[PDB]
């Protein structure tokens, strides 16, 4: 409710939002019964591994990292809407999905010329 509460996900090029503001902002919005106000950097450390948007500032150079290293390193890389082709995770499923039906219901044999039990429908 705190993370998505600032769409940490874009799908073309980048776009930052100076961290101070961001934080000092959610310090507001977030309703008094969350759990991101009772553990900020106890949730933040969990978060950093789920949102390659939040890049923690390195301790011994006190600057970001360019690359973002969330535990879902690969999965998150393969979901980005790659500009060459929409989204592999999308286009892949929209296909396997259709393949399911095609074999399932029995679309094949759709204009078969011969007695077919109603059950087959």
């Amino acid at each position: 409710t705190a993370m998505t509460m600032l769409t940490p996900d874009i799908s073309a090029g980048s776009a930052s939002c100076n961290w101070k503001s961001l934080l000092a902002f959610a310090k507001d919005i977030l309703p008094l019964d969350n759990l991101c106000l009772t553990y900020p950097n106890e949730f933040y450390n969990v978060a950093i591994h789920r949102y390659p948007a939040l890049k923690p500032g390195n301790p011994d150079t006190k600057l970001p990292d360019a690359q973002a290293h969330p535990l879902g390193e690969v999965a998150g890389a393969f979901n980005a809407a790659t500009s060459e082709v929409g989204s592999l995770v999308g286009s892949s499923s929209t296909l396997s999905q259709a393949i399911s039906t095609m074999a399932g219901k029995d679309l094949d044999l759709i204009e078969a010329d011969t007695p077919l039990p109603v059950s087959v429908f």
Partner: protein, 122 residues
């Protein structure tokens, strides 16, 4: 095992808190478990297939071996120092972040290339 690979910070033995992700300039090596190689191989396999059309049209750049994006590091590989301590892997096959980037944008660039021809063939 799974997750990013970890080696300890102070050195010597690795005790929890003595282990940090082995960040490198390229990026953090994340382990490539057996099944996750099935995908990237199954993806590259479907591209190599179009080899005869890549040469014909001077695009492409040779067959894409998944063994060009990985490495053979070794250490403890988990999701957190605590649990990564129970996965000592030797000479496992990890793919660094900056690599997880190419194997991505390559399979993406090539995917366009073929997606087109593959449409005419159809």
């Amino acid at each position: 095992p799974t997750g990013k690979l970890w080696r300890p910070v102070g050195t010597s033995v690795a005790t929890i808190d003595s282990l940090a992700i082995v960040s490198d300039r390229f990026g953090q090596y994340s382990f490539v478990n057996e099944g996750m190689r099935e995908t990237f191989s199954k993806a590259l396999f479907d591209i190599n297939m179009w080899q005869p059309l890549f040469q014909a049209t001077k695009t492409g750049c040779g067959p894409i071996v998944l063994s060009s994006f990985t490495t053979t590091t070794s250490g403890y590989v988990g999701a957190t120092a605590g649990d990564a301590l129970d996965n000592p892997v030797t000479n496992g096959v990890f793919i660094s972040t900056v690599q997880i980037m190419n194997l991505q944008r390559t399979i993406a660039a090539r995917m366009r290339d073929v997606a087109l021809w593959q449409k005419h063939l159809d």
